[PDB]
Design a protein around this ligand. Structure first.
Ligand SMILES: Nc1ncnc2c1ncn2[C@@H]1O[C@H](COP(=O)(O)OP(=O)(O)O)[C@@H](O)[C@H]1O
Ligand SMILES: [Mg+2]
Lengths: 369, 531, 70, 57
């Protein structure tokens, strides 16, 4: 029973090998107080982590140490590691092999130093970082297809056929989950509300969590909700106010399907995944279209499966069956697959024991994965 | 009353009484090792041996007629064998007058419920309930009285002219009553046993443009639901969308038809097994005691060594269980002879007689051996039968000196891989193994089970890497050997003369096979090669 | 008498507060079922329309193929 | 008096939301019955056009 702990920027999720459900999951916020201490004897904590920190955002500043699949400001991410191991999952690492997760190709130096930091101080027995998509594939029991996890920090595609991780068509994209929230900030300024600070900026992803459904034929649905007041929806902040969101409701997620709104000049996800399809052989396209699997988070938006099916079948020749696999086990499929992989006995020989690292130097992760 | 083992004519009442004497001296538990099953003609031996031991009470047997019905299973060869292990212990205090005897079953064959072999037949109880005799209980149980209607039963032959419970249903019902059962629990047992059949009618369809499974055949699901009381709609729903927790338990969802067909069978198997063990608890209840009983001499009955045609997973499991006890025997006799020869110390040949078996124990169990490969293979995506054997050949051929391949097994269907045990080279074909061991213990239905009749909640309230029969089995066998690790052994065997049942006269074809299988020849091998 | 009158009106306010809280939670559950049902009917309406348009296209493909086959 | 009006308003809004839920669930229950029938007719048409195109070739 080793361990499995996701790295992804949004929600550091911790659990045990084999178990079908992460034992503890919490947002990866790291907080610091932004005002002087006034009631002597508080015994203030000098930093806060996770849902404890999220509890009292009122006097807190929020640093996400994980942006775009790059681990920045390593001090706080180490703090998150420390809080995870001891408080959430509650075992010393000294007696548990550990496995982490990592987006396709983020930088070179990232793993090459992260293995060191988590392998020298925490003194873990053994570790092996596994690229996200291949793990996602295992999680669904399909050993052939294209993965689109789009974990909040980064979105990417891989072609995987008959269990081969065909590298060169890996098509990464930085259309992250958080940036939908950030754009929603700018679109919500227009209806007259304002969300300047950081705490409210955290709230808005919550308000995004429920009220963002992507709709087919964006033009017609847009003019539809413009003409009729049918879908005018309401919601309340933990303030007392109630906020009325109009067509922003379905103008949020469509930044995914076209980035012209956010500005980035890189085609929407459907065109990228079709691209990565068309950058393989003329025989692998027979099956690839059939096993398309969503994964990660940021795809729990209702409808996105169907809209995706429409766009692809329009793009691909209308002689293939594009039936896409979108189980509702999403947002965790990363972790399920990770646990299953840690459960494979043949997998035991793979990862790196302390001896190899000590006698070989840090590069062992890249050299042996 | 003395004559330890080589001072009296050969006789086992002697050795059992010597065990009594050991109890008097060492004050420590003893274990009776009965080889062979009722299929070996044994049943009439410990039924007398136990009374013998009690001499220096009749409630012990009364359990047998009923517990047989859920435990006797007719096989391909040597039919009508109780395939479940029932370790049986009789407690003595420091005094020596019998205070009580509690009974605990070990390593029940949990996979016999579904995917039985076509040639063989299921548990006797199923066909007991089948026969129209006592049709009022069938009226309670809503069964149509036709074996081939249902999926689980239709695998069986259900026509065994040698022995059917048609008469035996009266005796089993009578015992099952007079063992102190209220009528409510009495007919509830029938209710659960029937429902375990009754799932077999469940039928599912593949959802459009999607993956999960919708329920088909509402009426049989509803009859089941009434039979266990719980609502049909929520049951089918908990089938189509099980709940999996998170850091806060949102109602997570996901299934596939194949997974569902596997899982419902898993649930049936688990509920039946736990039902059986609870009946064991009730048998303890009607036999309860309150005297100071602490020192017991235990008789355990185990399935015999199995070698015959067309042997799947089940045979591998049973054989492994049977031979581990021989590992225990070899180590034990080695210990005693070790100290004895030590008193005459000159030089020992080769310590730890147990190595002879360890050489194959590692192959069956030790990580990434054989049993581990099935555990890994069910987990791995797209379980396909042939890939299993491909992996085995890749991993343990030549690398393992006990994993080889047979050739042209004359008339019996082609086995794939073979092992060289001491008792007999074994041949298996691994068809259906991936199906056999996959069994996901769905939670949501388990939690749904609490709001029904007293039995099912009572059974399933008391009590994860997707437990599969292999792991549960290994753990339980380790439990058993632990209980024997904390005891001392002695050995009682049984011999069958012939199928024609002619007493007094030998018939060589059979006895040679049983003697070789039983491992008495292996003990003679140990003595022969050694001091 | 004034204390007795106050205590009876306070108990009436607590009873109305309990009833209001119960009504507010059932209002919230009715609203949640309504928004989920509205979303699911709108999503399924898009899917059935897509399948119906593909059926019309499949009928046109069949009709031209049979004409050319003849 | 304010809580008396609020209780009557809350029960009114409950029935309006539950009526809206009932209408949407009743319509989607009929739509769930229809969608598989139209998909089966599509699968029949797809099988027919595929064999007609093959026979044409
Ligand atoms: N109700 C919701 N609907 C849609 N998306 C959501 C909802 N709740 C959270 N999310 C998104 O899921 C994201 C988490 O995805 P991510 O962190 O990339 O994967 P992981 O958590 O496995 O690392 C959050 O950033 C958030 O934007
Ligand atoms: Mg995350």
């Amino acid at each position: 029973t080793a361990l499995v702990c996701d790295n992804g920027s949004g929600l550091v999720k911790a659990g045990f090998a084999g178990d079908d459900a992460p034992r503890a999951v919490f947002p990866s916020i790291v907080g610091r107080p932004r005002h002087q201490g006034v009631m002597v004897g508080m015994g203030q904590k000098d930093s806060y982590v996770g849902d404890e920190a999220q509890s009292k955002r009122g006097i807190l500043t929020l640093k996400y140490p994980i942006e775009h699949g790059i681990i920045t400001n390593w001090d706080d991410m180490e703090k998150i590691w420390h809080h995870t191991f001891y408080n959430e999952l509650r075992v010393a690492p000294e007696e548990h092999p550990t496995l982490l997760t990592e987006a396709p190709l983020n930088p070179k130096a990232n793993r090459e130093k992260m293995t060191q930091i988590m392998f020298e101080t925490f003194n873990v027995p053994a570790m092996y970082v596994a690229i996200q998509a291949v793990l996602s594939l295992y999680a669904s029991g399909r050993t052939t297809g294209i993965v689109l996890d789009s974990g909040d920090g980064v979105t990417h595609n891989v072609p995987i056929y008959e269990g081969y991780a065909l590298p060169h068509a890996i098509m990464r994209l930085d259309l992250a989950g958080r940036d939908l929230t950030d754009y929603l900030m700018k679109i919500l300024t227009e209806r007259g509300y304002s969300f300047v600070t950081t705490a409210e900026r955290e709230i808005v992803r919550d308000i995004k969590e429920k009220l963002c459904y992507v709709a087919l034929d964006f033009e017609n649905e847009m003019a539809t909700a413009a003409s009729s007041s049918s879908l005018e929806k309401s919601y309340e902040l933990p303030d007392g106010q109630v906020i009325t969101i109009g067509n922003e409701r379905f103008r949020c997620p469509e930044t995914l399907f076209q980035p012209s709104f956010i500005g980035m000049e890189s085609a929407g996800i459907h065109e990228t995944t079709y691209n990565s399809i068309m950058k393989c052989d003329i025989d692998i396209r027979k099956d690839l279209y059939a096993n398309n699997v969503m994964s990660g988070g940021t795809t729990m938006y209702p409808g996105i499966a169907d809209r995706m099916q429409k766009e692809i079948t329009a793009l691909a020749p209308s002689t293939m069956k594009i039936k896409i696999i979108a189980p509702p086990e999403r947002k965790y499929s990363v972790w399920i697959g990770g646990s299953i992989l840690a459960s494979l006995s043949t997998f035991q020989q793979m990862w790196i024991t302390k001896q190899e690292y000590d006698e070989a130097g840090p590069s062992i992760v890249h050299r042996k994965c | 009353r003395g004559k330890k083992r080589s001072e009296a004519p050969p006789h086992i009442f002697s050795i059992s009484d010597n065990a009594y004497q050991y109890m008097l001296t060492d004050r420590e538990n003893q274990s009776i090792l009965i080889t062979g099953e009722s299929g070996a003609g044994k049943t009439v031996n410990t039924k007398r041996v136990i009374q013998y031991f009690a001499v220096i009470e009749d409630q012990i047997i009364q359990a047998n007629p009923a517990l047989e019905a859920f435990g006797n299973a007719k096989t391909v060869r040597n039919d009508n064998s109780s395939r479940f292990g029932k370790f049986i212990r009789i407690h003595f205090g420091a005094t020596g007058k019998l205070a009580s005897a509690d009974i605990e079953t070990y390593l029940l064959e949990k996979s016999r419920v579904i995917f039985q072999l076509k040639a063989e037949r299921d548990y006797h109880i199923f066909y007991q309930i089948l026969s129209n005799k006592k049709p009022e209980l069938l009226d309670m149980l809503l069964i149509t009285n036709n074996p081939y209607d249902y999926a689980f039963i239709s695998q069986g032959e259900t026509t065994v002219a040698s022995i059917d419970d048609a008469e035996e249903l009266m005796a089993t019902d009578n015992a099952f009553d007079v063992l102190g059962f209220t009528t409510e629990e009495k007919n509830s047992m029938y209710k659960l046993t029937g429902a375990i059949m009754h799932f077999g009618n469940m039928k599912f369809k593949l959802k459009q443009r999607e993956e999960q499974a919708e329920p088909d055949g509402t009426e049989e699901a509803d009859k089941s639901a009434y039979l266990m009381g719980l609502n049909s709609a929520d049951l089918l729903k908990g089938l189509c969308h099980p709940r999996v927790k998170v850091g806060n338990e949102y109602v997570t969802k996901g299934q596939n038809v194949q997974q569902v067909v596997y899982a419902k069978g898993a649930l049936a198997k688990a509920v039946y097994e736990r039902m059986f063990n609870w009946m064991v608890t009730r048998i303890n209840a009607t036999l309860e005691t309150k005297q100071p009983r602490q020192y017991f001499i235990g008789v355990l009955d185990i399935a015999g060594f199995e070698i015959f045609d067309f042997n799947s997973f089940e045979q591998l499991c049973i054989n492994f269980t049977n031979e581990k006890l021989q590992q225990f025997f070899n180590h034990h006799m080695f210990v005693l002879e070790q100290e004895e020869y030590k008193k005459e110390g000159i030089e020992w040949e080769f310590i730890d007689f147990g190595m002879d078996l360890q050489a194959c124990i590692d192959l069956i169990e030790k990580p990434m051996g054989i049993m581990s490969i099935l555990e890994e293979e069910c987990m791995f995506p797209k379980a396909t039968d042939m890939t299993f054997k491909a992996k085995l050949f890749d991993n343990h051929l030549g690398k393992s000196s006990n994993f080889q391949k047979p050739r042209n097994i004359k008339g019996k269907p082609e086995a794939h891989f073979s092992l060289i045990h001491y008792a007999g080279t074994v041949d298996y074909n691994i068809i259906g193994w991936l199906q056999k061991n996959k069994d996901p213990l769905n939670e949501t239905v388990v939690d749904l089970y609490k709001k029904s009749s007293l039995k099912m909640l009572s059974s399933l309230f008391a009590n994860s890497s997707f437990q599969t029969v292999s792991a549960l089995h290994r753990e339980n066998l380790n439990k058993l050997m632990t209980n024997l690790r904390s005891t001392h052994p002695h050995f009682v065997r049984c011999i069958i003369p012939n199928e024609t049942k002619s007493p007094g006269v030998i018939d060589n074809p059979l006895v040679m096979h049983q003697l070789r299988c039983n491992g008495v020849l292996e003990g003679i091998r140990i003595c022969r090669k050694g001091f | 008498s004034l204390q007795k009158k106050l205590k009876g009106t306070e108990d009436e306010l607590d009873k109305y507060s309990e009833a209001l809280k119960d009504a507010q939670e059932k209002l919230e559950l009715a609203e949640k079922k309504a928004t989920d049902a509205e979303a699911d009917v709108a999503s399924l309406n898009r899917r059935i329309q897509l399948v119906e348009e593909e059926l019309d296209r499949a009928q046109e493909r069949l009709a031209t193929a049979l004409q050319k086959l003849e």
